[PDB]
Amino acid sequence: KFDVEQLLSELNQDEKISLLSAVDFWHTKKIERLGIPAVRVSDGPNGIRGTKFFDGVPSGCFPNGTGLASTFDRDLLETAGKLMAKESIAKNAAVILGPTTNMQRGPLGGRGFESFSEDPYLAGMATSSVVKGMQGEGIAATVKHFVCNDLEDQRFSSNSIVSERALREIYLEPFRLAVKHANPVCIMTAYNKVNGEHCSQSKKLLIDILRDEWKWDGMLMSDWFGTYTTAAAIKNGLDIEFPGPTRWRTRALVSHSLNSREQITTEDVDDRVRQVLKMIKFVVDNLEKTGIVENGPESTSNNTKETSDLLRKIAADSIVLLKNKNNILPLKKEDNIIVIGPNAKAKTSSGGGSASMNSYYVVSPYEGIVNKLGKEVDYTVGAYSHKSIGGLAESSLIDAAKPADAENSGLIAKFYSNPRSDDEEPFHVTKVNRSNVHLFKHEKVDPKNPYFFVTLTGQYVPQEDGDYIFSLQVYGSGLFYLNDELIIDQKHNQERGGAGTKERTKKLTLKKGQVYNVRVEYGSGPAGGFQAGVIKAIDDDEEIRNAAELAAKHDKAVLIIGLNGEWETEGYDRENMDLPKRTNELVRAVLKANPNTVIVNQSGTPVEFPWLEDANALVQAWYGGNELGNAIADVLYGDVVPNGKLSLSWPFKLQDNPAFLNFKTEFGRVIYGEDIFVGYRYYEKLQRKVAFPFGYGLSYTTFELDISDFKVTDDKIAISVDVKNTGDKFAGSEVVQVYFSALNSKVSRPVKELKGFEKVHLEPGEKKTVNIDLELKDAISYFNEELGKWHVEAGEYLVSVGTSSDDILSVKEFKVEKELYWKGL
Amino acid sequence: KFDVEQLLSELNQDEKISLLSAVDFWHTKKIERLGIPAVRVSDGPNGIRGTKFFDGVPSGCFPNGTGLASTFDRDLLETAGKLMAKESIAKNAAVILGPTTNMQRGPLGGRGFESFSEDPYLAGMATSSVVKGMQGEGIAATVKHFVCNDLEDQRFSSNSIVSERALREIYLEPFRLAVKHANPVCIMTAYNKVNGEHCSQSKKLLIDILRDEWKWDGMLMSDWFGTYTTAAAIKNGLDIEFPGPTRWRTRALVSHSLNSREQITTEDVDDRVRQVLKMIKFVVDNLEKTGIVENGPESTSNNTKETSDLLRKIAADSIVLLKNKNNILPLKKEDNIIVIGPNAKAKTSSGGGSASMNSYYVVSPYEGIVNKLGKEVDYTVGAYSHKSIGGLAESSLIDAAKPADAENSGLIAKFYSNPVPFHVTKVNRSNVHLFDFKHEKVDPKNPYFFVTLTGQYVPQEDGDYIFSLQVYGSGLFYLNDELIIDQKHNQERGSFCFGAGTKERTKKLTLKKGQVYNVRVEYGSGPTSGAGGFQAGVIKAIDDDEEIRNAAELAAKHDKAVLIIGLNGEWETEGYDRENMDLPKRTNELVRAVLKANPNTVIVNQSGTPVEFPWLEDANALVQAWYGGNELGNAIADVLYGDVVPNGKLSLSWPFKLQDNPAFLNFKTEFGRVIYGEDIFVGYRYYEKLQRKVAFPFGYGLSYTTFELDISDFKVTDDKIAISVDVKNTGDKFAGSEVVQVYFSALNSKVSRPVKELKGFEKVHLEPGEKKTVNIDLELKDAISYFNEELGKWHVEAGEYLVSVGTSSDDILSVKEFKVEKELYWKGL
C-alpha cells in the first residue's frame, strides 16, 4: 500500500515541488512524513555502475548494445535484462538507466556502440526484451534517449530536423514497440531538439504522442542537466529533473511561476508529481520481491559463477563470423599459434561514458586463448592503437619490495584541502586501481565549488630495459614527478583537448628491475579528473616487421584489432571510419606473412577494412563485457558455434553511408536528409554494395529453410518456416529473418523491411518449424505524413524469408484488400 | 573615462552574467578588477529610506505624489528633485527608485497616493520636473512602474487588458513625457502583465517602444522579484534583476541557456550588460560632483533648517482649499479654537509601503497649530480611525526605574536562531518591518529566525485598554508572562504585511493608572511556521458614543473648531487596494455631530486619494492636505492662518460616490485580469464626457484672494502654438498664486475624443491688484494628437480646434479657435 492519489491529496505544495527534481545525482526525494522513500537510479544499459565512478563498486559488464542486438535472440535478451536486474539489486538501485535505443543513422555516432540497431524492428524488440527481463524481476527500466539523440556532437543544443515520416518509422518506432510490448516504468528525454524544440520540453513528444496517443503511463526524467526551462518543461511533460540539486525547479522558481500566472498552473505541477508517484509506487510495490534497501550499501554480491557463465554465453552469442575460407576456423587446440595485435592484451569491455563501469574483472582475448589451451601462448603486440596512454596504476605498486598482493597493487590517492605545513592531514585516502581518475563526495569538499588537491604516489618497476613514455592529462591542473623530479607540467601552460587538456608526455630511458618513485600532484577541477599513464616505447616499423616474421614462423596467427572506449564514447563522435594508427599496416604485413591469419575485431560500430580481400577469416567480437576473452576463445575453437548476425550495415567506405554529409551539428542543426532510408533501407534502395549487410553472419555448419505454411486473413499473418542444419559435424543456431515488401504501392517505400525473426538451435541433420504470427498492421503499414496516420494500404505484398537482408531463401506473395488507417499502439 | 565599450570588450562571460542581477536588496555588482563599483539604489518617490526598513536611519519625507502634483508648479517640483538628490547623497544612494507615475484610473488604488495625477499631461510634467532636479545634482532617477501597474490586487499576476489607444494616451504618456524632456537614467518595469505578457519580459514595451521608437538609452530594472523567466527576460530587454541574490540569472541558468541554444544568444546578454554599464557610467561620471562613497555609511547629515524650510514650503503649496464660506478662513490668532479629530495628533506623513521611511520627526497637525499660536490648544480626540492598533513601542520604556529618555524610550528586541542572540536592537516604532533585514548569521535565501520583544508599559489613565498582535510568521503576546494574544494557533488572513500577514487579534484588559506592566512578544519570522515582520500595540479604549458627544459640546463652546480627519498609510498602501471610498469607522458621525453644534468649523482631510464626504453640504470650510511629510503640521498651520495663501489645485477628480467612478466595476483582478473598460476616459475625461457632476473637479482649488484672466495673445504656426495670458489678483487684502490651465478640444473629429484635455499650465504669483502676463508655448502635434490605433501612429487630424484657458477643468474663462489645414501622422517622441 502506497497510494498515488491519496498521497497527491496529502502532499503540500513545497513537497510537490520537491518531488519534481532529484536530490543528488542518483536519488529521488524522501518524504518521511508520508512514507515516500528515496529511490536510487543507476547507469547503464550494459551493466550497473552504481553511485560512483571513482572507487566504484565492481560490477557485471555485459556486451554492448549493438553486440546484444546481434544475437537476434529475444529469450536471451530477456535473460540478460533479468541478470541486469540482479546486478542492480546488488547495488540497491531500484531503477536502471537503460536500455539505450537511439539509431545509427550513420556509423560515426559516439554512442553508436550503446544502442541496438539501425533497424527499428530489431531495436524495438531488443529493447522490449531487455526491459521485460528487468521488470519481471521488479526492477524498473528507463528507455533512453527520447528521441533523435543520434550523434553526440553538441547534443545539448543539436536540433534534429526530421520529417514526420522518418520520425515515426525509424526513431519513434523502437520506443513504440517497447511501450507496446514491455511498458517501461520510465523514459529518459534526450538532450537535443527535434524540429526546433528541446525534447525535454516538447509537448508533441512528451504529451501528444507518449500520453494522448500511446497512453503510456510511466515517468519521464530528463537526461542529466538536460532541462532548459522552468515553466515550459513542467507544462509540457517532463516529470522529474535530474540530477539534483535542482537548477530549474527550486521552490522559489516554481512557486513564483505559480503565484505570478506565468506559464504553469498547479494542475501542471500535480500532473508531473502524479507520474513521479507512480514510478515510486512501482518501486515500493516490488520491495518485497527485490529487497532494495533505501540509500542501502552497494556490493559485489552478484559476482558469481552463475553470472560469469551467463555473461560468457551472451558475449559469445553476440559474436558475428564474417569470413571463413579454407576452414581456418575453428582453430584446433593443437594448432601452433601466435596471438598478435593492439587489442590482444587490451580489456575493451565497453564503450566510453555513462555506459561504462568498474568490472569484477575483464578477460582479455589473449587470456581467453591462454585459458582455452591451458598453457603459455606466443605473443607479440604488432602495433599500438591507444588514443591516450594509461596503464600506470594497473602496473604499479605502493612499495616495490613487498609482493604484488591485491592490497599492495596500485597507487595511493591522498586528498588535501591545500596544495601547506608538514602537519596537514589527508581528509580521504583511496587505493587507486585504474589510471584514469574520474571525479565524488566529501564533507570537506564544497558541493558545487569543489576545491581540493590530490597527492598520487607509488612505485613503478620497469620489466624491460629501454625507453618508456609517461603521460598526464588533467582537467584542472597537475604535475608529474619521477624520483621527485618533475617530468611533466600540466599546471603552467594549457591547451584544450573535451573539457580538459591535451596529453603531454615525457620519454625516459629506464632500467629493468629498478624502483622509480611516481608522485602526481593534482589540483582540483576549478568537478574534475586526470590520468597519469605509462607505456613501453616501441619501434613501430620494427614491431610490424617482427610480427610479420613471427607470423611466418607459425601455422596460424590470431590478430586482435579494433577501436576502444576512448575512440567510441559518449561525448563526441568519430571523425572517420578508420582503424587507428598503424593497425592497417600491421594487418597487411601479417596477411602477407601468413595468409591463414584469423582477424578478430572489436568495435561498437563499423570500421573500414581496406585489406579485406586478403583476410581469409574475420570475426566481429564487439565489446564483450567481463567475459569477452573467454567468449572469443569459445568461438575461435568452436565450443560456441558462431551464431550472431550484424545488427548494422557495414559499408565499404565512410562516403557510402547515407548520413555522410549530415552527421555534424552545423549552425546547431542536423538535417535527416535520407528520410526513411536508414541502414539497409538506404543501401538496398541505391543498390549500393556494402562489405557486409544487415543480418549477415556465418556459422560452422550449413542450414536451409522454407516457408512450410502460410496464411493471411484480413487481420493477420501466420507463417511457418522449416529450418534444418544440413551439416553432420556442428550443432548450431540459425536466425530466420522475415522481411516485407509492397509490390504495387502509391507511396515510395524501402525495398523490404524486417518485421519478424526467430532464432533456432539445430543438432546436425535436425529439422524444426518456427511459427511467426503478426497483425498486418504491424507488418506492412507506412506512416502517411499528409494524413497524420499509419496506413495499411490495399495491394500486393511479398514476404521474404532469409538468413540475411540479402540471403533470401523462400518467398510468398499475398494480397491485401482491407485498407486500414490507425494511430496509437 | 569609464568607457562602456572598453569594459564590455573586457568582461568575461561570468562577469557579464553577474552584472545582470543585483547582489542584495539595494546594490549592483562590484567588478573590482575593472573599477566598476557597487551602485546603491534606494526608495522612494517622496523621500529616501536607505538600505534598511527596520532600525533605519531617519530621512526627509516629502509629501506624497498626488499632493506634489497638486502644486502644479514645475519649478517647485524641479526644486524638490534637487532636495531629493541631496537626501540621496546623505544616504550614499546614487540611484533613486522614483518618481512613481502609474495612473489613478479609479480612486481605490493602494498606491493611488504615490503617483501624480489621473492626467497624462500633469503626471508627465511632474515626473519630468522631479527627474530634472534629481539629475542636475547627478543623482539618477528610476521612473516607475512601467507600465499599467494601476491597482495592487494580485499585481504579480494581474493582466492589464487595455487598448493600444488608452495604452498610448493615458499610461505610456507620462513616461513618454519624462523620457522626452528629462531622459531618466533608469525605468522600473511593473510587476503586472499588459495584454497577456509580463511587463518585465515584453519585447513590445521594453524594446519595440522604449528602444526602437523613443530611442531611450537608459537601464531597465525589474521591480523587486518581478522577474518571471530566465531567458525571455534577457532576450526581451530586462537589463537587471532586483534584488539579489539572483533567482532567474544564476551563472548556471544563463550559461546553460546559452550553451544549449535555448532562447538567448551572447548578443542578448551583451545588450543587457551594456545598458547596465551606462547606468553605472552615469554614476561614476558624477562621483566627484556628488561625493557618493561605495557601500558608504548612512547619515542624517541633511536634517537641517534649510531642508525643513523647503519641505514645509512644498507641503504648504500642495494643500488644496476646497471650500471657504463666510470667511471661516484664514483663522485669526485671536480666534477661540478647539482642535478635534482622529488625525489631529497622529503623524500621517506618507502612504504605506516602499514609499515610506523613518522620519527625523513628523510635525502633527495639532502640533503645527500649537507652534503657530504658542499656547496650549484645547483638544479632544473625537473618535478613533486607525486600521490597526500600534503605539506600544512608541509609549514604552526599557526600565520603568529610569526617566523617559532617549535610550530608555523603546522596547528591546532580541534575535535567536532557536525559538524560546545574534542581534540586539532597540525599537521605537511598533511596526517591526523585517523585509530587508540583513545579518551575517541570516540566510537571505531562507531568513529563519526568532524575535523576543521586551520592555515595560505605564498607562496615564484608568479604564479598559485594547492590546493588539499582528504578524507575518508566528507570534505570542504575554502581559506579565500570562498569555494574552495568540498568533500561533489557527492564523487568519488579513491586511498586515502587504496583505500576506495576519488579521488583527486583540485583548481588552482593565489596567491601573501609573502601574507597571511587563510586555513580552515571542516572534517567529516568516519561514518558521521573505523575513517578514510583526506589530504589537496598545491603545486606551474609549466610550465611543460619549467621545462623540464630548467633542460636539466642546465644539459649541468655541468660536471655531478645527476638525482633522482622513486616512493613513495602512488604509492606503502598496500591497492592496481600498475596499471603498468611505471615511473609517465613526469619523462621519463625528463630523455630522460637530457640524451641527458648531457651523463655524474647518475640516482638514488627509488622504492620498478621494474619500466621500457624505456631510459635504453642511461643511463650510474644507481643506485637503494629502500626506505632507515631515513639516505636514507646520504646513497645515501656514495655510489655515494665511501665512501661506492656499495655492494647490486637485491632481484628481473627486466624485460624490464610488459608484460614480469609471472603474467602479473593474478595479479588482478577476481570473487574473483587469479590463480597462473606460478606455481613454480616465478621470475628468470620464466625468466631462458623461456630464456627471463631481464633488470637486480636476484642477480645482480656492484662494483667499480673487483672480481674473484673459487671453492677450494667440498665435499659430506650423509646429507651434503660442498663447499669452494676463492674470490679475483682483482682491485687495492678499498676495497669492493662481494656476493657469490650458486645455484642447477637437471639434469635428472623425474619432471619439474627450471633451477637453490638459496640455499646458503655469503658476503665477500676484500681489493685490497686480497683473502679469504668462506665455505658454507648445508644439502643435503634442497638443492636439490622438493615437490612431488602426494605423499604429499618432494622428494630427485636419479640422477645427478650441483652446480653453481656465483655473480648473470646470472653470473655463476664455477660449480661442484655430483651424488645422493639413494632417500629420507620427511616431516617436
Ligand SMILES: OC[C@H]1O[C@@H](O)[C@H](O)[C@@H](O)[C@@H]1O
Ligand atoms: O550518466 C547519467 C546519464 O547522463 C547523461 O550523460 C547520459 O546521456 C545518460 O545516458 C546517462 O544515463
Ligand SMILES: OC[C@H]1O[C@@H](O)[C@H](O)[C@@H](O)[C@@H]1O
Ligand atoms: O524597494 C524596491 C521596490 O519594492 C517594491 O516593493 C515596489 O513595487 C517598488 O516600487 C520599490 O522600488
